[PDB]
């Protein structure tokens, strides 16, 4: 997070001024890596 306080924000808004400030809420970045079997070779066959 990168919070910023706008000084006397309440006093300015009471006076009527409009106040805008950049913000960045806390995030959550994740990656799943799922193992997968690979059929490297398959040739013989049988009948059922």
């Amino acid at each position: 997070r990168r919070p910023v306080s706008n000084g006397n924000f309440q006093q300015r808004v009471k006076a009527g001024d409009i106040v805008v400030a950049p913000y960045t809420s806390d995030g959550k970045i994740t990656v799943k890596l799922v193992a997968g079997q690979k059929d490297i070779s398959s040739t013989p066959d049988y009948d059922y």
Partner: protein, 129 residues
């Protein structure tokens, strides 16, 4: 060297240091970040109150070393404030250090501490020639 001081009231804005061997000696730094509008521009303002307090004992009269003679201790408060913008911090440093040289040439080397202020004492600006 000099005795390091440990924090007493650790806060996001206020940190107060005191000498463990002498709790009277304190140095607290109070800081305040703000987003300030002055004109057609947004600036952040950082204010730092830097105050150091020493409870110095009264001066020993004349030249007796003696021993167990206690005299009441008097306070010695030295408080500074800083006002400016973070984007101007680099140029604020120059003003801070030239403020130091202005003060010491007037107070440290000078005799303004005694109460005698000198109009002719030469002092120097911030920006170079």
């Amino acid at each position: 060297a000099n005795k390091p001081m440990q924090p007493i009231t650790s806060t996001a804005n206020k940190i107060v240091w005191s000498d463990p061997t002498r709790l009277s000696t304190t140095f607290s730094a109070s800081l305040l970040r703000q987003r300030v509008k002055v004109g057609i521009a947004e600036l952040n303002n950082v204010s730092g109150q830097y105050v150091s307090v020493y409870k110095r004992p009264a001066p020993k009269p004349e030249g007796c070393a003696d021993a167990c003679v206690i005299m009441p201790n008097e306070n010695q408060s030295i408080r500074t404030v800083i006002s400016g913008s973070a984007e101007n911090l680099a140029t604020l440093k120059a003003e801070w250090e030239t403020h130091k040289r202005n003060v010491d040439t007037l107070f440290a080397s000078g005799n303004a501490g005694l109460g005698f202020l000198d109009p002719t004492a030469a002092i120097v600006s911030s920006d170079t020639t």
